Amino acid sequence: SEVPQVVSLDPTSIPIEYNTPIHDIKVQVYDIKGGCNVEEGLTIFLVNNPGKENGPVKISSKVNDKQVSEFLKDENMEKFNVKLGTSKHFYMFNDNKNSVAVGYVGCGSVADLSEADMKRVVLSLVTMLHDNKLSKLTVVFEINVDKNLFRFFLETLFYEYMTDERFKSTDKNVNMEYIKHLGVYINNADTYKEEVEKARVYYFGTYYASQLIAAPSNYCNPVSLSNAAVELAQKLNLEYKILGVKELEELKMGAYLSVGKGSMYPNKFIHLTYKSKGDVKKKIALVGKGITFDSGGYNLKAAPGSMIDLMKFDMSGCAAVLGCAYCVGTLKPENVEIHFLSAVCENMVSKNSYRPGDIITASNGKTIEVGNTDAEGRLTLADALVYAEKLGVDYIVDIATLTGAMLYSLGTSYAGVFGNNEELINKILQSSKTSNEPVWWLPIINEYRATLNSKYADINQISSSVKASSIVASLFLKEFVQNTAWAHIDIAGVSWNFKARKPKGFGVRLLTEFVLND
Amino acid sequence: ASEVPQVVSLDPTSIPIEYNTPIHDIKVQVYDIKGGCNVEEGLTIFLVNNPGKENGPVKISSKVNDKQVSEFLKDENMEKFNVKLGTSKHFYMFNDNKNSVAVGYVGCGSVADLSEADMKRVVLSLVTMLHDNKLSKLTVVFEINVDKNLFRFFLETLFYEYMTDERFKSTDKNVMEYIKHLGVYINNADTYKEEVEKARVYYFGTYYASQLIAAPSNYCNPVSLSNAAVELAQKLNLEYKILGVKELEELKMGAYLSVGKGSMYPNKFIHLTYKSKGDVKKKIALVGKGITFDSGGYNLKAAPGSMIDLMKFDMSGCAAVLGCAYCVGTLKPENVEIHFLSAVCENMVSKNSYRPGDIITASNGKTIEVGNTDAEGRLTLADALVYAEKLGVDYIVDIATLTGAMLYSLGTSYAGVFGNNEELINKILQSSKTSNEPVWWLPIINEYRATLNSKYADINQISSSVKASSIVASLFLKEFVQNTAWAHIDIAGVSWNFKARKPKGFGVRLLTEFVLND
Amino acid sequence: KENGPVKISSKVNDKQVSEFLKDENMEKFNVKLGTSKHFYMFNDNKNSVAVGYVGCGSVADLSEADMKRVVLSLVTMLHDNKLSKLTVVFEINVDKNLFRFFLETL
Amino acid sequence: SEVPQVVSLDPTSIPIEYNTPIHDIKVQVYDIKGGCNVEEGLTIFLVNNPKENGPVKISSKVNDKQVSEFLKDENMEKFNVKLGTSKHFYMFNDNKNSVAVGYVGCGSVADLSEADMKRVVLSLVTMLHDNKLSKLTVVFEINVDKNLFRFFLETLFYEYMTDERFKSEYIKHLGVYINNADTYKEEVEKARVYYFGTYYASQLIAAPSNYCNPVSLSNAAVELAQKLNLEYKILGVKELEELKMGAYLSVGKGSMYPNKFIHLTYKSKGDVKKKIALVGKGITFDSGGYNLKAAPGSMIDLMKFDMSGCAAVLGCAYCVGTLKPENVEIHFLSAVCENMVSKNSYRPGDIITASNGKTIEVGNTDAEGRLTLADALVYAEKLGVDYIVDIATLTGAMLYSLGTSYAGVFGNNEELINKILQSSKTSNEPVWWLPIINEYRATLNSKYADINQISSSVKASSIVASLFLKEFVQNTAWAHIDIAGVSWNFKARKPKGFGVRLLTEFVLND
Amino acid sequence: FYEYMTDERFKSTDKNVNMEYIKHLGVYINNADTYKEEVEKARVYYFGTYYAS
Ligand SMILES: N[C@H](CCc1ccccc1)P(=O)(O)C[C@@H](Cc1ccccc1)C(=O)O
Ligand SMILES: N[C@H](CCc1ccccc1)P(=O)(O)C[C@@H](Cc1ccccc1)C(=O)O
Ligand SMILES: N[C@H](CCc1ccccc1)P(=O)(O)C[C@@H](Cc1ccccc1)C(=O)O
Ligand SMILES: [Zn+2]
Ligand SMILES: [Zn+2]
Ligand SMILES: [Zn+2]
Ligand SMILES: [Zn+2]
Ligand SMILES: [Zn+2]
Ligand SMILES: [Zn+2]
């Protein structure tokens, strides 16, 4: 509970914004075939030209206004093209002689938009909402989208539009105002309508994870993070338990505790539970890596490209899991019991830190020789995994910013998934597809197992030879799940949006889809 | 006996030590080959060379008291095999008593005087014969010429290499039994019989050092290390004194204390004493470098090839000294007084650590400018040497994993010896020859002395210019021995067996031969 | 049983070698993937033959990598043999493809 | 041979000054007991205090009323004896003659080291450089070995000699006052020879690689041989190919300069009782090859010095050719080439065949020395000599093992090693015996070739390189002197000409 | 002043067994009667600099 402080100006909680301007947006969805009233604020058509690359903009929707209609006559729009991401703004007077702003975002030639295209599309739309004080946006859909994509559209629109100012003080945006109303025209209205509030929940889960990740390590430490989880659990009516050092010791979580030894913040193990009202048909343990700061320990992140300044993000996995708890706690799925777990600690350099070479004992009795204190994640997860399996769940899915190697394998767009069970991996895949958080299945190659053979301990933490460290890390983790379907999502490469200089909150939607569709 | 401080209750508070090794259960028997070879249960190995003829055929010279085995090992049957160094074969036959026997041979090359290291290759080949094969008995037949030392050496090496440290094994113990009988057939057996128990002592001394070295730095720390020394002293009836920080401060050991400042473990200075029953004719101080973990301090071991993960081994000198204490305490030499010394501490990074640039004062009043916190060994040794010489000894020999340069100079096989005294150096060199722990005499080049001229302090810890750091470290050390014959053995290169991934326990035999042949 | 004792099932048309392969002598060795032992001995013909095993672990399905480990162990015996023929007896379960891999790797 | 040229301004040879100012100096030696004359020039006393850095006190009787006052104890008490500390003053002598008088601090050390004596000779040299003098007179108020006395001389000459060849005065008389000046006279001209051999090596080393390339270097050796009446043979690529020197030729492949193998021979007049082959590493520039010297601290700019070994050997040829020892036949050898990056260079991974038929896998093109030496050693042994000594700036590791002061000696023969050590003692070029550790041999076991050039594992590269070289001497006493650490004087930014005296002493005493 | 002063606060065994400063500094300069004011300023400046040092 009580966050330790070195100086009274050290902050004692993570600032969190629950009531975002996004949440205040009154959303309306309409059937396209009833026609668009273009009345105020800004009214953007999403338009594609199926086939011809860089085609004309032709506005299909019947528009209930002679003047907007004349404006948008194919003739008038022909000069503008649809190159995905192009946008144009139009200013005119409608029927009641009321100046309206209109425009379109180019949606490309390909009539089925990829997740990445939909993103580039929202981004164009958000640059239209920035630097333009608007009370109302209206998006007319003149493209084919499935229900998940329109949900994604909204999730991304909400999340990209949002602008984290928690840490701003003298350099807040003096000229920032949010829309109060969002109008959406689409075909099949009724069907897409259900995606709206789902999107809003998904948005917040993601954004909430985002907020935790973005919170710097002085704000977001093991104590303040676990406090925030307790606060979230209380707001969602989730069962929660925070395991403190004494309990951790009793549970013999030596790998986890060893990582935290060097920190001024006592380890805190987060255990949230959501139980369905009905019969419980599926028990799931979601495990997030919760390193609130990763200095590397005595294996200090000193090497070029080690990005020590980014390491506040090493609790992204935990964030993903918490954001998911938000979503599941809000959407209240049936027939599931979900455990949200994170072995939270901070990996620091101290007289008290664990050293390279240390042999430590995991809660399952396996002794581990520490080859590198910067491979701390898998040590914390090891004990979290033993814990998860002791819960007697059907699935254990962990999500962790585990390996920098992910940048070299999948890059910044697709997370890696490893696991010991094909059905479970496929479930993650499907959840990847429906959440639009891209995940790729990577192999746990058993041949590498032998390089974890320690001369003194039961197991090495790291390989000496094998540079395929995401695989090796997975091999290591696999040793801590005895008999349960388990999957591991390495979001090290994807978690942080380097270009936008912010977290993605990656994994919240994925895990939620996973929980919801199982 | 002091409390091992702990961070968490899962932190171990002692080094686990195996005193009663399976090797102590081996009943060993030497028989003269004149008498002939009883070939029965177990495995009966011949050590055979073919003088001059490189990879020549195997010939069994010795009498075998069995028509059947004899017939089997008759020349016509043995020329399908060659004596190439370290090669081996397994034979299977039914003996004179209708009993099935396992006989074999290890090829001893073609040079009838195996060097220390060939013999190491020969043992290794024979160990592999003992591994994966539950034998109650090994019978070895020397059909090669070795001398007392070399014969011992084989026993000592065999014992050592056979033993398998499972102390840090939990779920990954090997399911591994040990021969309970060693039979040796050699010419002039009676002259060799005396080597057996000496080898067994030497083995354990070495193995004991090995145990300490291998113990990771969370297990083996200054408090637990000194506790183990106390325990060893108590078992051997040695006088002991452990100097704690208050006494160290009183003694003004600022160089030593500065190193430890950053550690959570208080410095502990180990002082063990063996005094002979008779008139004391020689007083020897053995000083071992006792850095239980060397992180490098603020000069963190972050550079490629700095091998931070190995740095539990930086107390090897202390280990060698302690193992030597075991041998001396056990073999009880006469007319000698031996002091076993190690200034034990841990070189860590902390708000309390000493910094590069700090000027610190040794117990002899010399002020030292710290140019690199990673050159900590010489600092601790400085104060240890001043202490040693205050004891009024005839010789001071320090042994220390002092400089990584040793890898560049002598490599992994031969330790470097430097000293201020030729007679003493020659004694170490003779001891090298008789212990078969290879050492090479390296110069203390006075020309380099000037690069230790600090602008502010009396002396620089490190050279700025001279890259010959083993020699520079030696020059630095020399400054702390005013008037006593002193040698320094740099075992940095040699202490860890990188290929086998284990300590060698290097120096125990060397130091014990040194002590004993005086 | 990981690192399980060796037990030869095949009947062999030799008395000496059958004796050598009995369960009592063979239980002294283990099946740790890649572990081998092998002895020279005289067969019912006073002919000089070598006999052993290569441990194939405790999994009834060998991977390619696992097979490579087995072959590598064989190939070791081979590089120190001035023998005339190799006989490999599969006391493990292998499909057509793995078997070709075994040969190609050997 | 015509050195090839990229441009009309590419030097086609190495400037060499043979007639150094140091030759026009007349050297005289007076028993100090007789007293000291102060007539002209500067007079330096070599004084020590056997009190650490204690007061100065001049011992010798001195033939000048007015200067003896300057030398009075209470005047000198103002000055100290700390190693290499000096002061000197101008004044007027007995005959109003502008004489300078001073001292050098010889520390408290009773017996001067090779090092401490350089510090004396350096302090003294400063004053020579800052002072326009006719004569310099040195007074020995300390103890010196005939060898240390000779060392004093050559160190003086050499440090005093300033190489001005690459730019766009000196005393004409040297006085020595020494206790027992009869024993020492013979050291003078020996010192002078030794000086020049060293200085000549120095000159070659210092010459940049555009000046000193394989063609110009061999040309210079030929010129030296001609001046000394030595037999000489330069092997060109056609002969090297016929001799199957593929290790050596591989290294040179990338160079615009054809390999040149220098073979000089001095044969004694009398019965030849000892045949010696001296082999010097002669890489005129070492870029590293495709293993380019790009790493921090690889000092690519220094790599003109990678023919130091060759220079040492040529300098020694000068001394031997000049001093004309008896009962020895000496072969001076260097497989000279340049290690360059080119479409024609050998690559890492190449397997090449030495002249003895051993195939070598090239693990690193920057470990080229041993490749050239291999072929040179096979050549040397074919000569049927009693000893082969190679000297080479072979391994940077030497800086980490012995540093900049002592060269490393490895060998396959104790007697020969001891001879080198004895030569080290008498030449005052410090050498230390390092082991060839056979345990490391196995890391030269190539999977494909007969042998690997480098270890993969072992970082003890001086030892590994020695193991590799050993492979190319079948049956002859052989020693290898690694002067990589010691060859260049980094502080003075010049070569030391290391090895010339060592090798000459070796030849002369054995 | 600054370059003449040796800092020995951190020696103890190192000497300095020779180092002893002049007691007198004489200067001879043109219109010295002006330069004279610079002397004590220099001494203050020296010590400020030396103190920082
Ligand atoms: N949270 C770290 C990886 C995340 C990351 C993301 C982007 C760029 C760089 C790093 P880590 O726990 O230090 C994991 C180590 C794994 C490791 C560390 C040290 C030795 C072996 C493996 C790594 O992948 O670098
Ligand atoms: N206990 C360390 C060396 C032991 C060792 C053994 C094998 C490989 C690497 C290192 P050290 O005290 O840091 C010795 C320092 C010496 C040193 C001297 C001056 C500056 C920095 C380091 C070093 O070798 O790194
Ligand atoms: N002409 C080089 C040594 C000269 C030298 C002297 C002092 C400092 C740096 C370099 P080398 O042939 O590249 C010898 C290599 C040895 C070597 C061996 C194997 C791989 C790479 C380099 C080296 O020590 O750098
Ligand atoms: Zn890490
Ligand atoms: Zn991490
Ligand atoms: Zn260190
Ligand atoms: Zn150390
Ligand atoms: Zn090179
Ligand atoms: Zn070179």
Q: How do the helices and strands line up, and which of them pair or pack?
A:
This is part of a larger assembly, with 5 copies of chain A.
Chain A: E1 26-31, E2 42-47, H1 66-72, H2 74-77, E3 87-93, E4 99-106, H3 115-129, E5 136-142, H4 147-161, E6 181-186, H5 189-214, H6 222-236, E7 239-243, H7 245-250, H8 254-260, E8 268-275, E9 282-288, E10 290-294, H9 316-331, E11 336-347, E12 359-361, E13 367-369, H10 377-390, E14 395-400, H11 405-409, E15 415-419, H12 422-435, E16 439-441, E17 459-460, H13 469-478, E18 485-490, E19 496-497, E20 502-503, H14 508-517
Helix pairs in contact in A: 3-4, 4-5, 5-9, 6-9, 8-10, 9-14, 10-13, 12-14
Shape-level CATH architecture of the largest domain in chain A? 3-Layer(aba) Sandwich
Radius of gyration of chain A, taken over Cα atoms and rounded to an integer in Å:
24 Å
Q: Give the number of helices of chain A.
A: 14
Oligomer: part of a larger assembly
Any idea what the CATH superfamily of the largest domain in chain A is called? Zn peptidases
Amount of helix of chain A: 25-40%
**Strand residues, percent of chain A:** 15-25%
How many domains would you count in the coordinates of chain A?
2
CATH domain fold name of the largest domain in chain A: Aminopeptidase
Number of strands of chain A: 20
Ligand species = ligand BEY, zinc ion
Largest interface: A-B, 41 and 37 residues
Shape of chain A: elongated
Largest sheet of chain A: 9 strands, mixed
Broad structural category of chain A: alpha/beta
Q: Give the terminus-to-terminus CA distance of chain A.
A: 35 Å
Subcellular location (chain E): Cytoplasm
Family (chain E): Belongs to the peptidase M17 family.
Protein name (chain E): Leucine aminopeptidase
